[PDB]
Amino acid sequence: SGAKFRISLGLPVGAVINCADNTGAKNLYIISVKGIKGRLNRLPAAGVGDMVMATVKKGKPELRKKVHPAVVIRQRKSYRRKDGVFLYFEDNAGVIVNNKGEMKGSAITGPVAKECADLWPRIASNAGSIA
Amino acid sequence: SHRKFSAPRHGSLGFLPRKRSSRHRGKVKSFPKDDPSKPVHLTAFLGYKAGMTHIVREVDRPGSKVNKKEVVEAVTIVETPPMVVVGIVGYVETPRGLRTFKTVFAEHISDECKRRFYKNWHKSKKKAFTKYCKKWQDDAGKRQLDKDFSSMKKYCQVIRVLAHTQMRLLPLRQKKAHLMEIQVNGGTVAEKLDWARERLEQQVPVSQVFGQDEMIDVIGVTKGKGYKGVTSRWHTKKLPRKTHRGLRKVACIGAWHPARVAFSVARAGQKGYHHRTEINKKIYKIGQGYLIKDGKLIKNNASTDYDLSDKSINPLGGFVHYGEVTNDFVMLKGCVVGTKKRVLTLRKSLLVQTKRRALEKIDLKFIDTTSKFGHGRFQTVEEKKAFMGPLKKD
Amino acid sequence: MKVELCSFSGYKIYPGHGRRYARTDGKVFQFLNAKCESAFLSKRNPRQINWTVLYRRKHKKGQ
RNA sequence: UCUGGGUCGGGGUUUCGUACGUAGCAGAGCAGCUCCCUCGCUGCGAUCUAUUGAAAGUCAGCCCUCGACACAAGGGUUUGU
RNA sequence: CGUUCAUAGCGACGUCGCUUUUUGAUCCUUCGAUGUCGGCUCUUCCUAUCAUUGUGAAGCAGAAUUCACCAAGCGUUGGAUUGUUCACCCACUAAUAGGGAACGUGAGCUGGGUUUAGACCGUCGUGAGACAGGUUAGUUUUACCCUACUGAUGAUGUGUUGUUGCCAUGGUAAUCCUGCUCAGUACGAGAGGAACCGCAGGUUCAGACAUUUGGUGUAUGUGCUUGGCUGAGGAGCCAAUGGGGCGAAGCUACCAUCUGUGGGAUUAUGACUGAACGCCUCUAAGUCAGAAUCCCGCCCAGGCGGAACGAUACGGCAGCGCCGC
RNA sequence: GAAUGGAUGAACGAGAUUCCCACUGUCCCUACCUACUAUCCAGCGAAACCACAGCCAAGGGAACGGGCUUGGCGGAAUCAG
RNA sequence: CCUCUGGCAUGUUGGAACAAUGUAGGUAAGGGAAGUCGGCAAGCCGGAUCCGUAACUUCGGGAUAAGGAUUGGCUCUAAGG
RNA sequence: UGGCCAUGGAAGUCGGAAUCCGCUAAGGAGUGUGUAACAACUCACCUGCCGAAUCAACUAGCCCUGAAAAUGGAUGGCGCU
RNA sequence: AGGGCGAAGCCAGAGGAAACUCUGGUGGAGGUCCGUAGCGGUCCUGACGUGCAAAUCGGUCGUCCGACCUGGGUAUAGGGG
Ligand SMILES: [Mg+2]
Ligand SMILES: [Mg+2]
Ligand SMILES: [Mg+2]
Ligand SMILES: [Mg+2]
Ligand SMILES: [Mg+2]
Ligand SMILES: [Mg+2]
Ligand SMILES: [Mg+2]
Ligand SMILES: [Mg+2]
Ligand SMILES: [Mg+2]
Ligand SMILES: [Mg+2]
Ligand SMILES: [Mg+2]
Ligand SMILES: [Mg+2]
Ligand SMILES: [Mg+2]
Ligand SMILES: [Mg+2]
Ligand SMILES: [Mg+2]
Ligand SMILES: [Mg+2]
Ligand SMILES: [Mg+2]
Ligand SMILES: [Mg+2]
Ligand SMILES: [Mg+2]
Ligand SMILES: [Mg+2]
Ligand SMILES: [Mg+2]
Ligand SMILES: [Mg+2]
Ligand SMILES: [Mg+2]
Ligand SMILES: [Mg+2]
Ligand SMILES: [Mg+2]
Ligand SMILES: [Mg+2]
Ligand SMILES: [Mg+2]
Ligand SMILES: [Mg+2]
Ligand SMILES: [Mg+2]
Ligand SMILES: [Mg+2]
Ligand SMILES: [Mg+2]
Ligand SMILES: [Mg+2]
Ligand SMILES: [Mg+2]
Ligand SMILES: [Mg+2]
Ligand SMILES: [Mg+2]
């Protein structure tokens, strides 16, 4: 119901955020950000809570050499919450996911940002810590 | 050939000759339409941008994720000491336009105001409206005055009051008080005029014009930035590193064959000190100034029902590059045009406001009052004196 | 508006100001300003640093 | 002459992070002298504690002073229905 | 052909056209030189409309759709390979439409490619040498003139001066999307599966701003530290800003925050009354609804265009304003 | 395609490519700072270039006009770009 | 890089400002070559001591391969004539 | 009158050779709709009302559709019914 | 300049029945490596481009005991060197 609000989005296309679920992937080469019309010369950028296409660069060879959807869960670029607290996360991080928002993994190492948790429920269910 | 990859053009043509504004005091380019029905009122005011700060508030837009969640919010303090009406000035409709018809000035006029009428006051003998004010004490003059007012009753349509600021009461350097025509919007012109004739020489405070949680339009001149290149002034792409004759430029001004450079092409020139009328700036707080019943009432500014301390909106060490706001002020949401100290015209909206957001009632929870002259960490001096304890300066 | 305390210095942090850090261990820190946060990230033991609360508690200052 | 604006000073604010000096039974050890006492005394000795959120800067485009000091109708060129 | 049915969509055999974003013809212009491809950057136009608004069509149940109309307001992206144009692939998207401006744009760049001289290879040549055959290395000049544009002083007028104002004319701006709700509802055998009004937000664009987060930082602010140098201490300096922490103010970032509006005429279209044509017809006279259009509004600038009001040279020589003659 | 040398090849190369790690304002996307300029002033003081000149639309015209035709129009003297 | 001896007056001028463009330096959040014909440019790396060192090889090399750790100040000890 | 060819079904009706008589006031061995095929529907001859012209096929005048380009624009301009 | 690598020869010790082999030193080879002066002149396609300059400047670079650099003297002269 209640919609997202924009947040300072510090993952341009070209990032390798570390996969923080138990798949067997280690990295997630963001090749594109979902739901970006975009402008000339401008890199598509995914903050936290953003869907994303993601090649795996290192990990299991099942996953390597193909594209998966993914979600950004933490991010090192400090966004501002509506309550006027800026927040950043120590590492950029995501999870491999399917089109309809379900995880293909099962358990999320590390904390998930609540911008991502509220917007992705199945991620939120497998997230131990939030914010 | 066509440009390969499309892109929307940089900057708006709806804003140009991007030149240094003639005026300093921002003109009200249109007052609202006076319905004749609702009672008489002033449509505009003239404040001063003293400074910014936080607020905190519970928000009540149901549906949002932020419903019943305390957000913070930036705000401008516009110090607005009461204006003095010193004139009225009748207008009449014509097919040519809207001719000024008759200006009746008050009797007594301050040196605050009289300042304005001379380019050099030190050197003048201060002889303005001297033979004028003779009119206000005889049979002949008073009669002519009445006939002028009667004529305005017969003929005029639009009536604007002339008021001016109380430059006296500010922390600014200048004494030369800003005048301004403000339009009286209300009932019939005869009623309209006798209201302004009653208000003559009198104070008018801010609360008489505006009310709380009201969208108003801020009108002013932008913070000026001098000569600026095209990359600053139009936000054109920089060219790359290797460019031989510089790179904060536009490469192709224009095509060959309209063999002129067009008005739509980006060139370097004056950036800033433009006239600009930002609209829909909601008044969160109309704040009561310092006053005396026995001791000072400094509290009445930045105290909220939920805070209850003894603050004023003045932060520690004052608003920077300004002063103390010792007078009544408004507190708009967000930034507004111009610099610190800049004279600023407020104006009631041109527009029938009926959006959820524009009828929202603002209850403030907390005004930040920490210094802006560095990273502040104490809200008030008494709090600081508590936290630190005693210092070597004792 | 729950005023928080700076995880380095000890000062209160009013709603507006400062920054919130969320380490992957899964614990969070609040910093009044960058000055605190830099000393935190460079691993400065705030009890060694005079101007913090933790130092002054340690050295019995005031009282 | 709303006596004013200005310089200096004083507060406030704020930046940095605790000055010099002095004292110490703090100080890894070392030495000189002896009362060869090794807590003897005296010296060297990074650093430490205390004095000390100290010192220092803070409009030059921060805020208030009404404290000290002078200085404030002065000059030149104009223009007429 | 389309089960059936020439024309929903198509369309053979024939035929009539437009177009100059293809390539040819041609050689009128330029050989006392008009800088020869592509990309970047920027502006503007066209429509032969991909999307978006409003609509007619279907072989349109819904969803998806192709066909057509008004229509160019607003958009039309990120990459891999290639010097490329072109091409192709991945990804996102509402859509990844097509062009023009000396095949826009070298005193705007770049110079990868063509296209000197150095060299290699292949084929051809007795050979010098040749090759829209491949390769590698190879100088990208000048603006202070005039205009145009950008901003900047001014100009004639109004007796002089100041004021607060009006407004001729120019410009002009907003965009599209998601989610929730309607609703697993209409529609449909089911599978699937809408829409209007609301509500919450976001894209791109525009205009600001610095409370906050970030950036800068020679306040050369305050520590810390290298080498040297004032006999040492203290206090300092030098090393083209010695180096580095932290850093006020100030600039400043979708890297922070705020704001972005209302009418009128109508177009396509669908209608009314209604003849022409004893009926019927949206039309012939007459009338209605009607839009990302257009015109204005708001918004920016403000005319060899005006306005009301103020004060109008005590003087040491002054000089003027009215009035009447 | 075999001393018009063929195939090879460690070491070496301001030689020609391709990828990876690191690293970065190359870029997303631009921003702030410093010095010397440019700027204004005193003094000093060149050059190239120059038919006349210098606002446009369209027309025709040696088939892309500043000048011609028909329209739009036109306001001293200048400054930085 | 800083200093004494000796030598100079900043390289054919001065002053006031601190705009745009530049020339020469720097710094940048998150990402890290997505830029571009092409990592061009800049950045990383750098000294020393101690470990540790691959493929390949003409057995000489490769080799500072790579990859690691340490480094200051102070007060002592031991070892070298 | 399931007329005949065609069976895959065409008793008027995908198509084609046929193609007349009766009743007749008069209805084609059938214009279509549609059917597996019928059915059902629909398309002359005649009336009832109303009250003088009505209707077809060609043809040529003006006008209109056909009729899409990129700086803003040209019956020469203003304009003109 | 200053460093690096450490070739032959030489010493000792250990093994070997012999052949000889290992280990530690010493030794200081080389159109050897780094790198100054020197000589050069890669890239920035940087600066400059009516220049400082009719080819210069800055950083970045190649080489730096050898087919090394370099003064003076001397030889070769135009279809000739
Ligand atoms: Mg691009
Ligand atoms: Mg296009
Ligand atoms: Mg270049
Ligand atoms: Mg501040
Ligand atoms: Mg057929
Ligand atoms: Mg041709
Ligand atoms: Mg030319
Ligand atoms: Mg069309
Ligand atoms: Mg061209
Ligand atoms: Mg050109
Ligand atoms: Mg060129
Ligand atoms: Mg080339
Ligand atoms: Mg060649
Ligand atoms: Mg000049
Ligand atoms: Mg000292
Ligand atoms: Mg030097
Ligand atoms: Mg119609
Ligand atoms: Mg209508
Ligand atoms: Mg309408
Ligand atoms: Mg207009
Ligand atoms: Mg051969
Ligand atoms: Mg042979
Ligand atoms: Mg051969
Ligand atoms: Mg000419
Ligand atoms: Mg100098
Ligand atoms: Mg000099
Ligand atoms: Mg000289
Ligand atoms: Mg960066
Ligand atoms: Mg690219
Ligand atoms: Mg690339
Ligand atoms: Mg390089
Ligand atoms: Mg190697
Ligand atoms: Mg060059
Ligand atoms: Mg030049
Ligand atoms: Mg010189």
From Swiss-Prot, chain A:
The modification Phosphoserine is found at residue 8. The modification Phosphotyrosine is found at residue 29. The keyword Protease does not apply. PROSITE patterns: RIBOSOMAL_L14. It is found in: Cytoplasm. Keywords: Cytoplasm, Phosphoprotein, Ribonucleoprotein, Ribosomal protein. Its main location: cytoplasm. The keyword Glycosyltransferase does not apply. Gene3D superfamilies: Ribosomal protein L14. GO terms for molecular function: large ribosomal subunit rRNA binding; structural constituent of ribosome. GO terms for biological process: translation. One of its GO terms (cellular component) is cytosolic large ribosomal subunit. Belongs to the universal ribosomal protein uL14 family. HAMAP family: Ribosomal_uL14 (MF_01367). Component of the large ribosomal subunit. The ribosome is a large ribonucleoprotein complex responsible for the synthesis of proteins in the cell. Component of the large ribosomal subunit. This is Large ribosomal subunit protein uL14. It comes from Oryctolagus cuniculus. The lineage of its organism: Eukaryota, Metazoa, Chordata, Craniata, Vertebrata. The gene is RPL23.
Curated annotation (Swiss-Prot), chain B:
Keywords: Acetylation, Cytoplasm, Isopeptide bond, Methylation, Nucleus, Phosphoprotein, Ribonucleoprotein, Ribosomal protein, Ubl conjugation. The modification Tele-methylhistidine is found at residue 244. The modification Phosphoserine is found at residues 12, 303. Coiled coil: none annotated. The modification N6-acetyllysine is found at residues 135, 285, 293, 365, 372. GO terms for cellular component: cytosolic large ribosomal subunit; nucleolus. There is a cross-link at residue 293 (Glycyl lysine isopeptide (Lys-Gly) (interchain with G-Cter in SUMO1)). The keyword Isomerase does not apply. Residues 1-36 are annotated as: Disordered. There is a cross-link at residues 38, 223, 225, 285, 365, 385, 392 (Glycyl lysine isopeptide (Lys-Gly) (interchain with G-Cter in SUMO2)). Constitutively monomethylated at His-244 by METTL18. Methylation at His-244 regulates translation elongation by slowing ribosome traversal on tyrosine codons: slower elongation provides enough time for proper folding of synthesized proteins and prevents cellular aggregation of tyrosine-rich proteins. It is not required for incorporation of RPL3 into ribosomes. GO terms for biological process: translation. Residues 17-30 have a biased composition (Basic residues). GO terms for molecular function: RNA binding; structural constituent of ribosome. It is found in: Nucleus, Nucleolus; Cytoplasm. Disulfide bonds: none annotated. It holds the Pfam family Ribosomal_L3. Component of the large ribosomal subunit. Interacts with DHX33. Component of the large ribosomal subunit. The ribosome is a large ribonucleoprotein complex responsible for the synthesis of proteins in the cell. This is Large ribosomal subunit protein uL3. It comes from Oryctolagus cuniculus (Rabbit). The lineage of its organism: Eukaryota, Metazoa, Chordata, Craniata, Vertebrata. The gene is RPL3.
Curated annotation (Swiss-Prot), chain C:
Mono-ADP-ribosylation at Glu-4 by PARP16 inhibits polysome assembly and mRNA loading, thereby inhibiting protein translation. The modification ADP-ribosyl glutamic acid is found at residue 4. GO terms for biological process: cytoplasmic translation. There is a cross-link at residues 2, 27, 35 (Glycyl lysine isopeptide (Lys-Gly) (interchain with G-Cter in SUMO2)). One of its GO terms (molecular function) is structural constituent of ribosome. It comes from the Eukaryota. The modification N6-acetyllysine is found at residue 27. Signal peptide: none annotated. It is found in: Cytoplasm. GO terms for cellular component: cytosolic large ribosomal subunit. Keywords: Acetylation, ADP-ribosylation, Cytoplasm, Isopeptide bond, Phosphoprotein, Ribonucleoprotein, Ribosomal protein, Ubl conjugation. Belongs to the eukaryotic ribosomal protein eL24 family. Component of the large ribosomal subunit. The ribosome is a large ribonucleoprotein complex responsible for the synthesis of proteins in the cell. Component of the large ribosomal subunit. This is Large ribosomal subunit protein eL24. It comes from Oryctolagus cuniculus (Rabbit).
